[PDB]
Amino acid sequence: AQSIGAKLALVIKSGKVVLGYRSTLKALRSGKAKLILIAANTPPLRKSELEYYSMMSKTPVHHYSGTNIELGTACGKLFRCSTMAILDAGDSDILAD
Amino acid sequence: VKKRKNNGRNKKGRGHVKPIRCSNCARCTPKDKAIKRFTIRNMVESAAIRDISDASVFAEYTVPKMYLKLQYCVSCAIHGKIVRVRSREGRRNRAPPPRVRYNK
Amino acid sequence: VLAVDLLNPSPASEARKHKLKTLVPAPRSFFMDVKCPGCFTITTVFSHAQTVVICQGCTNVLCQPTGGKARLTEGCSFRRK
Amino acid sequence: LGPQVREGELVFGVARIFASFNDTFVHVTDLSGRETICRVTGGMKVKADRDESSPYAAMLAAQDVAARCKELGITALHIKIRATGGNGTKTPGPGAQSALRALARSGMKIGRIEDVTPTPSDSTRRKGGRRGRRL
Amino acid sequence: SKRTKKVGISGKYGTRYGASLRKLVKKQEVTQHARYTCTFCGKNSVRRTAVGIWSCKSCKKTMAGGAYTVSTPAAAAMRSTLRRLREITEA
Amino acid sequence: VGKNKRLSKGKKGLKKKVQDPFTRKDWYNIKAPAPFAVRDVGKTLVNRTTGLKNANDALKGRIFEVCLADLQKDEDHAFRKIKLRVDEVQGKNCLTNFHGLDFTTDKLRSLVRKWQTLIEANVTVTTTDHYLLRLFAIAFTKRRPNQIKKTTYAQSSQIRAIRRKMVEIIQREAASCTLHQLVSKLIPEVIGREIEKATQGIYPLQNVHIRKVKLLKQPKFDLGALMALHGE
RNA sequence: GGUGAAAUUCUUGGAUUUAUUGAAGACUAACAACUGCGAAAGCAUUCGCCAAGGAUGUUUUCAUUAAUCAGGAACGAAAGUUAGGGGAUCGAAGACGAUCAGAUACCGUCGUAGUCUUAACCAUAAACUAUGCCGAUUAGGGAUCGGACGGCGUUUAUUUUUGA
Ligand SMILES: [Mg+2]
Ligand SMILES: [Mg+2]
Ligand SMILES: [Mg+2]
Ligand SMILES: [Mg+2]
Ligand SMILES: [Mg+2]
Ligand SMILES: [Mg+2]
Ligand SMILES: [Mg+2]
Ligand SMILES: [Mg+2]
Ligand SMILES: [Mg+2]
Ligand SMILES: [Mg+2]
Ligand SMILES: [Mg+2]
Ligand SMILES: [Mg+2]
Ligand SMILES: [Mg+2]
Ligand SMILES: [Mg+2]
Ligand SMILES: [Mg+2]
Ligand SMILES: [Mg+2]
Ligand SMILES: [Zn+2]
Ligand SMILES: [Zn+2]
Ligand SMILES: [Zn+2]
C-alpha cells in the first residue's frame, strides 16, 4: 500500500478536497462525496459514526495504515488531520480500486 | 627485503581472516597461512587385514576408511619434517611433488 | 601488426568490438514489427524495452523485460525494421 | 550360568575401547551400556606408569578380557572405536591396534567396525593460550 | 548566552554531593522533565504526575509506565515477543 | 600399578565378603517390529526379580543400536544404524518399538569433498499419530561428464530455492503419515526420488539423503498399537 | 590426570569409564579456494521484516554541474574505563608440584579481573601492498567472479524458450 501516498499527491495538486471532520461530515450529508479516508488512531466512536454515515450514503471508506501525524504530512500540510473526503478526482484514478 | 611475493600467507584482496588452532602446539594462525594435510588411512595396518578377514563373521569384508585433516603452524611444519627448506630458485615452485608410482 | 591502415578497419573488426570502442560510436539496437496472432494490428516495439507493451486490440502481452533485450511471447513472430 | 541357545547360532556383544595418547581402556558390555561384562586397564597389569599405554599392555589386557568373557557365553564382539575427541587429538592412541589384534588372534569373532570419536559442530576456544606450548 | 559549560540542569545543587553523583542524577533527571507525544490523540502534551503515572493534557487520558520514562525497553520487547508468540501459535 | 595406592579404601575401611555378582543375572530375548524382516536381534542381561526391586521396571527405559543391514538381511544398507526403545517386557520376550535412525560417520566423511556445494536442511513435523519428530536432509552438487572447468559451484539464489523446494516437499510428504507407512518409505529411500525429480531443473543435486530422524514427544502408551505391530 | 621423567589433585564416603535424561553460557568444524563484499577497521547456522550498494543493459533525463584539500568533521581491531544483566570454557594477578647452583619463567593441577550483552568514553596498532589521490600512453599468454551478446550439441522435466 505504498502507492497510495504518491496517488494522493496528484489528487491534491489537480482536484479539490476538503480536510477535517466537520467539513467531511457536511459533504457526506450533501451526498456528493465519493471516497472517505480515516486515520488509525481516531476514537472508535468517531470511527463507527463515520462508517455508519458512509454505509447510509453508499460511499467507499478507506482505513489509512498510519496515525494522523503522517496522515497530515502526507498532504503537504503542516498540521495533523484525522479524516478526509474526496469531493472530486482530478486527473488521478483513485476510484479505480 | 621481500623474501616471498605472497608474504607467505596467501591473502590479497581482503583485510582479515578468522584464525585456527594448530593441531600440535595449540597456537593460533590464520587459516590461509597454516599448512593443511588431508589423510586417508585404514582401520588396521596392512598386516592385520587377513586377521580381521578370517576373524569376521560376514565371509568377505571390506574394512572402512578413516579421513582426517590436520593443520599445523610453520614452526611445527619443519620440526616434524612435513616440509623442508628449499633453495632460492626452488622456493617459487608451487607444483605438487610427483609421488613415486613404481617404487623400484 | 607494425603496419596497419587504421583509417579503414575491416567491417568484421568494427562489428566485433564493443559498441563504444569503435572508430565512431553506433548503436546495436533496433526496432521491429511483430505479428500478433489474434488481431491484424501493428505495433512498434523497442528491442530492449524496459516496460511491458500492451497491444491496442484484445489487450495481450507482447514481451517481458529482462537484463538485455526483452523476451517475446512464444506464440509470436517478428521482423527487424 | 549362560543363556541357553543352540550350538549353531552365536550371541553378540559390544566392546568400547578408549585409546588416548596416555592410557588405554577396554570395556565390554552387552550391546547396551546398562550392563558391564568386565573391565580392565593397563595400569594394574603393568609395573610402570609410562608403560600403561603401550601396545604390549593393551594386548595383555585384551587377553584376560577374552579369558574373562569366554565363560559368560558371549562368543562374538562388535568394536566401537573412539578417540579423545572434543578439543583433543582425535587420533586413536598407540594401543588401539595391538589390543584389537590380540582380540582377533585369541579366537573371538569380529563384526561391525566403527569409529565413535566425538566431533563438535563448533567448539569453544581450546586450552593453551595464544602462543601454545613452547617446548 | 549558555550560562553553563557542561553542568547543565543539575546546576541547582551548587558545589555539593560530588561531580559523579551530580552527573548520574542529571542524566536521569533530564528525561523526567521533558514532554512526550501522546499515543492516542497525537498532541505533544504528556507529563509525569506520580512515580509511575503519565497523563496527557489534551485528551485527559492517564497511563501507567516506568519511573522516569513512558516505556521501558524490557516491557517493549516483552509486549512485542508476546504478540509474535501469540499470533504464530494461534494463527 | 600395585604400589601407587596411598589411602586405598580411604579414611578407614574393610574388605568385602560376597563376590561374583553374576549368580543372580537373567537373559532375555529381544524382538523387532512388524516392517522389519528378522525379529531376533540378540540377547540382553538384567538382575533377577526380587522383593522391593522388580525386574520389569529395569527393562522399560533401555535403548539399542542396531544396524539396518542386519534387520533387512541386505548389505546395501550397511551404513545406517537405528535406535530401538524398549516399552513392554512380556515373559522371556522383550518387545521394542522405533526410537530413531542415523547414518554412519565414515560414509559422511567419504561423501564430503572439496570444490563442490553441499545442501543441508532440517524440519520438524507431526504425524496423524501424535508424534513430534524432526528430519535432517543432505545433498551435493553433481558433476557433468563433459565439464572441463575444474570447479562446480552453485549460486546462493538457487541454493535457497533448493532449500525451499526441499522443505516444501518433505513437509508435504510427511504431513499425513503413520510410523509403519513412513518406515516402509524409509527403507527403500522413497523420499529421495521425489526430491531429485522435483529439483533436477534448477540444478542436479546428486546424493539426496535423509541424514537422521529424532522424536521429541510421545502420547499415552497405547498398548493396543504395540500389540498390533508385535506378534505377527 | 598430565609429562623427557615425577609429584601437587580425585578415589570401594565407588574414582575413571559405560548408557539414558535435564540445565547453563559461548561458538558455527568439514564444505572453505592464489574465491566473494565493504571507505577502512571488518563480514560465514536457518528463516521473516526494514532501509542501503556495486556491476551489467539502455535510440530515457539535466548539461560542466568537476579533481585534490590548510583548519574542521564522521568512522576507527585488541586492550582499558563508568553503570546494570550474564558468568559454560580459558585465563593477566595469586597459591601449589617439578627442573635447575639459583628459576618470582618455559612444563602440570587450581584460579580473580577479563572473555558475552545493554547505555556511554577512550582514538592508538608491523591500522603493511612498509608503495598518497585523479587523468593519458606502453607486451605476449592463460586461468577466474558478476552482467550482456552469438553458436554446434548433450541432459532433462505437463518437458518446448528457460535451468545444467
Ligand atoms: Mg576491495
Ligand atoms: Mg590488518
Ligand atoms: Mg599413562
Ligand atoms: Mg623450540
Ligand atoms: Mg560409576
Ligand atoms: Mg556451517
Ligand atoms: Mg562464496
Ligand atoms: Mg588535515
Ligand atoms: Mg574494542
Ligand atoms: Mg559488570
Ligand atoms: Mg601456567
Ligand atoms: Mg584452569
Ligand atoms: Mg571489553
Ligand atoms: Mg602512529
Ligand atoms: Mg594508506
Ligand atoms: Mg546464450
Ligand atoms: Zn604448532
Ligand atoms: Zn490483439
Ligand atoms: Zn492525548
Question: Looking up cell 546462493, which residue turns up?
Answer: F156
Distance CA B55, CA D100 (A): 11
F34's grid cell: 512388524
Closest CA to D64 of D81, D47, D49, D42: D42
Q: Which residues are CB-contacts of D104 (< 8 A; sequence separation ≥ 6)? A: B48, B51, B52, B55, D110
Looking at chain C, after which residues does the C atom sit over 2.5 Å from the next written N, breaking the chain?
A: none
| CA atoms within 13 Å, Cβ hemisphere of F129 | 16
For chain A, the residue count is 97
Closest residue by Cα to residue E28 from E63, E70, E69, E75: E69
Closest CA to D101 of D59, D56, D132, D50: D59
User: % helix / strand / coil in chain A, to the nearest 5?
Assistant: 45, 10, 45
Chain D 31-90, residues with CB within 8 Å of chain F CB atoms: 31-32, 34-35, 43-44, 46-49, 52, 72
| Torsion angle (degrees, nearest 10) of CA F219, F225, F226, F231 | -170
- Burial of E43 (C-beta count, 10 Å sphere; 0-12/13-18/19+): middle
SS3 C27: coil
> Which uninterrupted H or E stretch holds A24?
helix A22-30
From the CA of D92, how far away is ligand 14's center (Å)?
A: 50
Instruction: Flag whether E56 is marked binding.
Output: yes
C22 C-beta neighbours (distance < 10 Å), count: 14
Alpha carbon distance D123, F64 (integer Å):
28
Helix (H) or strand (E) holding E73: helix E73-90
The residue among F73, F77, F119 whose CA lies nearest residue F101 is F77
Cross-chain residue pair B27–D131, CB shorter than 8 Å:
yes
Method: cryo-EM
User: Please, which residues have CB within 8 angstroms of residue F194's CB and are 6 or more apart in sequence?
Assistant: F169, F173
Return the amino acid letter for E16: R
Q: From CA D5, how far away is CA F102, in angstroms rounded?
A: 31
Between CA E39 and CA C68 the distance in angstroms is 50
E39 touches chain A (CB under 8 A): yes
Strand, helix or coil at C56?
A: coil
Residue D70 Cα distances to D17, D36, D57, D67, angstroms = 18, 14, 20, 5
Q: Is E13 on the interface with A (CB under 8 A)?
A: no
* Phi-psi category of residue F217: left, alpha or beta, with phi > 0 → left and psi -120 to 50 → alpha: beta
Name the minimum distance, in Å, from the CA of B47 to any CA of chain D.
10
The burial class, CB within 10 Å (0-12 / 13-18 / 19+), for F53 is: exposed
Which position has the grid cell 565371509? Answer: B59
Instruction: Quickly tell me which residue has 569373532 as its cell.
Output: D109
F168: cell is: 516444501
- What Å value separates CA B88 and C1' G95? 52
Q: Does F109 touch chain B (CB under 8 A)?
A: yes
Measuring CA to CA, how many Å separate E68 from each of E28, E47, E52?
A: 8, 10, 7
**Helix (H/G/I), strand (E/B), else coil: D51:** helix
Sheet holding F118-126, edge to edge: F63-67, F80-90, F93-103, F209-217, F132-140, F118-126
**Can you tell me the distance from the alpha carbon of B11 to that of E53, in angstroms, rounded to the nearest whole number?**
60
Indicate the pairing of strand C31-35 with strand C77-80: antiparallel
Q: How many CB atoms are located within 10 Å of the residue A33 CB?
A: 23
**Closest chain F residue to the Cα of D44, Cα to Cα:** F1
- Closest CB to F104 among D35, D44, D114: D114
Distant-in-sequence, close-in-space partners of F215: CB < 8 Å, separation ≥ 6:
F99, F100, F131, F132, F133, F134
- Distance (Å, whole) CA A22 – CA F30: 85
**Given the C-alpha cell 565390554, which residue does it identify?**
D28
User: How far apart are the C-alpha atoms of E74 and E67, rounded to whole Å?
Assistant: 13
Residue from E70, E54, E68 nearest E24 by CA: E68
Q: Which residue of F has its CA nearest to D118?
A: F105
- Cα distances (Å, whole numbers) of residue F66 to D117, F28, F69, F227: 19, 17, 9, 21
Beta bridge partners of F47: F25
Hey, are the CB atoms on F27 and D12 less than 8 Å from each other?
no
Cα–Cα distance, E35 to E48 (Å, whole number): 9
Contact between residue A95 and residue A35 where contact means Cβ atoms under 8 Å apart? yes
Contacts of A80 in chain E (CB under 8 A): 42-43
Query: What count of Cα atoms within 13 Å lies in the side-chain half-sphere of residue D115?
Result: 25
Question: What is the DSSP code string of chain F?
Answer: -GGG-SSTT-SS----S---GGGGEEEEEB---SSSS-----EEEEEPPBTTB-SGGGGSS-EEEEEHHHHHT-STT-SEEEEEEEEEEETTEEEEEEEEEEE-HHHHHHH--SSS-EEEEEEEEE-SSS-EEEEEEEEE----TT--SS-----HHHHHHHHHHHHHHHHHHHSS--HHHHHHHHTTTHHHHHHHHHHTTT------EEEEEEEEE-----HHHHHHHS--
Query: What residues have CB less than 8 Å from C62, skipping those under 6 apart?
Result: C34, C36, C43, C45, C52, C53, C54, C55, C72, C73, C76
Q: Which residues pair with F214 in a beta bridge?
A: F134
Q: Are strands F118-126 and D12-19 parallel, antiparallel or unpaired?
A: unpaired
E44–A contact, CB cutoff 8 A: no
| H or E, element range at B16 | none
> Of F74, B64, A44, which Cα lies nearest the Cα of D113?
B64
Beta-carbon contacts of A89 under 8 Å, excluding residues fewer than 6 positions away, are A11, A15, A34, A95
C76 is in an annotated binding site: no
Secondary structure of B57-94 as H, E, C letters: CCCCCCCCEEEEEEEECHHHHCCCCCCCCCCCCCCCCC
Buried b (16+ CB within 10 A) or exposed e, C44-70: ebeeeeeeeeebeeeeeebbeeeeeeb
Quick one: three-class SS letters along D81-133? Answer: EECCCCCCCCCCCCHHHHHHHHHHHCCCEEECCCECCCCCCCCCCCCCCCCCC
Question: Counting ligands in written order, which one lies closest to the CA of residue B24?
Answer: 17
Q: How many residues does chain C have?
A: 81
What does the alpha-carbon distance between residue D29 and residue D77 come to, in Å, rounded to a whole number? 10
Give the closest-approach CA distance of E63 to chain A in angstroms. Answer: 16
Q: Is C55 annotated as a binding residue?
A: yes
- Pairs across B and F, CB distance < 8 A: 7
Q: Which residue has the cell 512485542?
A: E80
Q: Using CA atoms, how far apart are residues F43 and A14, in angstroms rounded to an integer?
A: 90
What's the CA gap between E49 and B18, in Å, rounded? 54
The answer to whether F74 and F40 have CB atoms below 8 angstroms apart is no
Q: Please state, in angstroms and rounded to a whole number, the distance separating the CA atoms of residues B55 and D91.
A: 25
Kindly state whether F106 is in contact with chain B, defined as any CB-CB distance less than 8 angstroms. yes
CA atoms within 13 A on the CB side of A27: 22
For testing the chain A interface, which of E40, E45, E61 should be mutated: the one with the most A CBs within 10 Å? E40
Q: Distance in angstroms, CA of F203 to C1' of G31? A: 18
